[PDB]
Structures are given as structure tokens and as C-alpha cells.
Design a protein around this ligand. Structure first.
Ligand code: ZN
Ligand code: ZN
Ligand code: ZN
Ligand code: ZN
Lengths: 347, 347
């Protein structure tokens, strides 16, 4: 039973009004699922999609959203491997060509023809959204759709970042911003990979939280004068890897200094105007690697989701109504960091 | 301008008559290219498909062939990244499911639902053949379609085998069966990878040939009493890798004995009843690795074809007509001391 009209939050111009209104229910193309999106996560990527900040061309008008968890209600005639009622996730990468220099290496998100949910393609901020059946995330029936929604972006992203760090079991990883939502996920995934976790954040409250997630050590930058030296001493020479969850330029540039000889510094996320600086003498002498980590591919997606469904990662959410989504945008625009919001599309 | 009827060599039963006749032109599914096959290589795999020798279930009736080079004349509604007039190669792996553990890790040829050209799916021994667009090889416009056709099987295969050997530049690779068609290609690819090549085959004619391709050493098993000892002596302890292009059981078992400490013994091809025997004491003491090397993935394919297009590997061909293809089968069915055939589909 598929309606012809649905609620959605849509804008017709970049920076324009975020209108909660009725729009038609899309009909899936031959390769696409039609998903009844039950819940959708939100993050700053949606802010920048709406603002048009990025040098990537977005669609107009546009339904935003790239963290949708829902139920397959239909699919095109050429879709295979899917059954009506299956749980599906609509992610940042909606689709790619599957046969280019980047797709054949498992870097589908780098495809020149990538379709991006909530950027080039109407995303998860509606009740019914289309998504290519090959790229859509398989969600087990045992998974809470609301709880899994943020894993589709933050969870896969930090998991992929840790794989990019390419660390051995028992090695040290420093997580910058370890007490935030993204960083807290990163701590848990790092524990699942057998890593010793050093968390960096501000405040004893964040410190206690990070410790409760399995971090071996916490460095409070509101109390530690020389974070670089402290991180180097606590790991007996520096962490073998670092995940720069915090996009503060100060924290990133410190990560280049405290990483161990032969270590991996991983950059995550899409900040504006952030520049990492590295002294070439020390970069060479220590054979450091500064690696960008973008979005997980289908293999990464399945692994990260599986760790979540096994209960090894927890991402507490605050459920609000889709009709209220505009407020979140405003908040993201007006700074003021806030917890993890999940919109219910029936409200 | 696409006909509805075409010429093809087709059989209705395993070992049945190989009929050159008219059959319908296929219609591409939504995921497929329709390729006007200009040329097709031929090899013993087609013999085994026709005979039904392999314990893999083949389709009946069947157009054979898995080494096709042609021009895209159409494509299904979901195909992107391809344009009419592009040169395309039809290979052993025609298509895969895209949603199993093997497809998502880049091992599509292990897909349980793999479609195999000229085995489960009508292949390149026709004028118009369909191929899944995700698996089709892009052939540069600078490449001669007839000459590139055998690279699509033999070339990619031996290149993948050398990658499987995982050798360092300057190391020794022994190529067992170096004077045949497959082995001669392996010699050339090994030289392009900067390896020192020791060729093993039978007869001074093959020895001259192997030397002319740049092999540093040739061992003639018709005139060498102790092949193992000779190969070890000539490489000062054994080759770092060996490619068993010959599917001789005795030669494979010799390669286990003469390979260097820490060396890689690579198995290639799909023989019947060939069993490698390895003494466990020596396998452990020398930490040898016996590795199977199957079909190249799309990265291997692009690299092998590029080396051909740059002129670094040559596979001389004899061009005959598709109408004559039955004779080749007969020769392959009988003993055969014959070159590399490429059928022209217009004759
Ligand atoms: Zn997000
Ligand atoms: Zn692509
Ligand atoms: Zn072949
Ligand atoms: Zn598969």
C-alpha cells in the first residue's frame, strides 16, 4: 500500500526555506528500491548541502538527508536479491557506475558519476525515497531502524577511518574529539578492532565517558598544557595511528606531531578552510603517512553495520519529528553542538 | 543498424555437431552491452566447454567463446559509462551477482552465480553477443581488436599468475611450459615486470624461442636428467617464484621441489585429475607457498591490456573465419601442434 503523496523537508534554492510539505512519492527506476524511510539521521553534511558551501554541484529542488533506515516497499523490474519488507539503508553514496577506475578498486564514492543522497539525489528526509539496489545497505531485521540510522554515516565513516589507519592488534590509536558523537563511535569501533585507545577531548565529563567506552587513557586538553608531549609519553613514543575526528585545525596539526615513528595520521570529514601543516624534515625522518579517509564501500558498510547489530557499538539518539527538522538545520547553522538527532518521518 | 539474425557456431549437445548457422541476435538486458564481436580468440577452454569435460554445469544449446573483441552497438537502460562505438572485450566472466561476499571483495569470478561466456552464457563465437556492462573490458581505440582478443584470456591469466607469485624486481621466476602459447606470453609479461626468467620446456626449438623472448636461461626437459637439480643450480638455490603454465602433474611436483626457500609456487589452469604432492617437512622447513591463480579481476585486466597496448607483450595470431571454427575444435580435440587462432566473425 504505497501512497501517491508524502511529507518531506525540501528546499528549492540553496540557503532557501526548508519547507515541510507534501510532495509526490517517487517511482523507482529499474535498478532502484523504493524505501519507506522510517527514520533518518542528520549531520552537518546536510547543512552544507543546503547552504551550497561545497564546490560540488547539488540538485535543486532537493530533499536532503543521507542517513535513512526504512522498509523496502517496492523495487524496479530489474532488481534482484531484495524482497518486499526487507530493511534497507539509504547512504551518502546512492549509486555509482560500478565499472570505472575508482569503482573497480572499491572506491565507488570517488566515481565521477556518483549519485549522492541528499545532494544530487533526493535523500532520506522524506517518507519514500529511491536508492540503487546494489549500493543500499542491508539492515538485519534484528536492528532498530532508528538506532541504526546514524551508523549509516558516522559509524561506517569512523570504521573506515580506522581501517585506513591500518593498525595491528595491540597497537595504539589516538582519537581526537573522543567524547563527541563521532569520536565516541570511533572509540567503540577501535575497541572492536583490538586497539589500545587514547582519547583526547575537553573536560572531565567527556573523560569519564570516554573511559567508560573502553579507552585505556584520556588526555583532557582543558588541563594538559602540552598535549603533544603527553600523548607521546603515554603511548611510549606516540600512537601508531590517529583518527582526527575533531576538525579543529589545532588538533589536526597536533596529531601530525604526536604520531609515532612510522605512524598513520588519518583525516576524516569535510571541513571548511581546515589545513593540515607538516614539517617535511620530520615527516620524512619519521616516515609518517597522512591519509584521507572518505566513505566506506559496500564491504566496509556490511562490517560496520554488523558490529553495531552485534551490540559492540552504541549510538544513543534523540528522536524528533521530520516536521521539526528545520530546527536542527538552524542549530547546525548557528553553531551550538547538540546530540544525535533522528527524525521520525511519520511526525 | 542492428540485425535480428546473425551467424554463429553453436552446439545443442556436449560433443555434438558444431554448426555454423543463423541464430537470433540477442537483446541486451538492462545491465548488458550488445557488442558486435569483430574477432574472437580460441583456446582449449572452448574445447572443454563443448566436450563437457569439466565438473561444472554448462548450458545447452550453447554459443562458445570467451575471448571476444568488438564494438558496442547497444546497451540496456541501466548501463552508464559506456557509449556506442566503444571497443569492448568479452571475457570468461560475463557477469556476477554483485551482492555476495566474493563480488563485494573484488573476487567476482568466485561468485556462485557467475555467468561464464561460452559456458553458461552465449559467448564470442557469434557476431553479436551480450555482456554485463560491469564486467566488460574497455579496449583502447589504439588496440587492434584481433590482436588484443587473446590477451583477454591468456594474457590476463599469466599476468595474474605473476602477480600471484608476488615477486620483487630482479628475482627469478621459473616458467614451466615456457615455449607454448600461454608460456611465451608469461615470459614476456615477466620480463616487463623486471624479473629474471628461467624457462622450462621440451625441445631445442622451444629453447631458441624462449631465449628470443628474453629468458636468461632455458632448461630442456628432453635433455636434462635432473630438472630439479639443474633449475636449483642455475638460480643459485631455486627460483623465487614458479608459474606452472604447463598443467603437467610431474612438472608441478618438480616445481615444489626446486622452488627457493620462502618461494611461491603458482598453479594455473583447470586440469583433470592433476594432483600436487608436497612433502610437509620440506614445505614447512622452506616455508613455501603453493598458490592457485584463477582469472584476473578488472584491475588485473586493465593492467595486462595496457601492457599489450604499450607494445610490451605480443601474441602472434592466425586469423581465420568464424565459419572455419569447427576445424580448430577438431584440431584441439585431436593432438595439436598449431598456433593461436583468432576467428573473424564476418567470414
Ligand atoms: Zn551524515
Ligand atoms: Zn564508477
Ligand atoms: Zn581462452
Ligand atoms: Zn556474487
Amino acid at each position: 500500500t504505497i501512497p501517491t503523496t508524502q511529507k518531506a523537508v525540501i528546499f528549492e534554492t540553496n540557503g532557501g526555506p526548508l519547507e515541510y510539505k507534501d510532495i509526490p512519492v517517487p517511482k523507482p527506476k529499474s535498478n532502484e528500491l523504493l524505501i519507506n524511510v522510517k527514520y533518518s539521521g542528520v549531520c552537518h553534511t546536510d547543512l552544507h548541502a543546503w547552504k551550497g558551501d561545497w564546490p560540488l554541484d547539488n540538485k535543486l529542488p532537493l530533499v536532503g538527508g543521507h542517513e535513512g533506515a526504512g522498509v523496502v516497499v517496492a523495487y524496479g523490474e530489474n532488481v534482484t536479491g531484495w524482497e518486499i519488507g526487507d530493511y534497507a539503508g539509504i547512504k551518502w553514496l546512492n549509486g555509482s557506475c560500478l565499472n570505472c577506475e575508482y569503482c573497480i578498486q572499491g572506491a565507488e564514492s570517488s566515481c565521477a558519476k556518483a549519485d549522492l543522497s541528499g545532494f544530487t539525489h533526493d535523500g532520506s528526509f522524506q517518507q519514500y525515497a529511491t536508492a540503487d539496489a546494489t549500493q543500499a545497505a542491508r539492515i538485519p531485521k534484528e536492528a532498530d531502524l532508528a538506532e541504526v540510522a546514524p551508523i549509516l554515516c558516522a559509524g561506517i565513516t569512523v570504521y573506515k577511518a580506522l581501517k585506513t589507519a591500518d593498525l595491528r592488534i595491540g597497537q595504539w590509536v589516538a582519537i581526537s574529539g573522543a567524547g563527541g558523537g563521532l569520536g565516541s563511535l570511533a572509540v567503540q569501533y577501535a575497541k572492536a578492532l583490538g586497539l589500545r585507545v587514547l582519547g583526547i577531548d575537553g573536560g572531565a565529563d567527556k573523560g569519564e565517558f570516554v573511559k567508560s567506552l573502553g579507552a585505556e587513557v584520556f588526555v583532557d586538553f582543558t588541563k594538559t598544557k602540552d598535549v603533544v608531549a603527553e600523548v607521546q609519553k603515554l603511548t611510549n613514543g606516540g600512537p601508531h595511528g590517529v583518527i582526527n575526528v575533531s576538525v579543529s585545525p589545532h588538533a589536526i596539526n597536533q596529531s601530525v606531531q604526536y604520531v609515532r615513528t612510522l605512524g598513520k595520521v588519518v583525516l576524516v570529514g569535510l571541513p571548511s578552510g581546515a589545513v593540515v601543516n607538516s614539517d617535511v624534515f620530520w615527516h620524512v625522518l619519521k616516515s609518517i603517512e597522512i591519509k584521507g579517509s572518505y566513505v566506506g564501500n559496500r564491504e566496509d558498510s556490511a562490517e560496520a553495520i554488523d558490529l553495531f547489530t552485534r551490540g559492540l557499538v552504541k549510538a544513543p539518539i534523540k528522536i524528533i519529528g521530520l516536521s521539526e527538522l528545520a530546527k536542527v538545520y538552524e542549530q547546525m547553522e548557528a553553531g551550538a553542538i547538540i546530540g544525535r538527532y533522528v527524525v521520525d518521518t511519520s511526525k
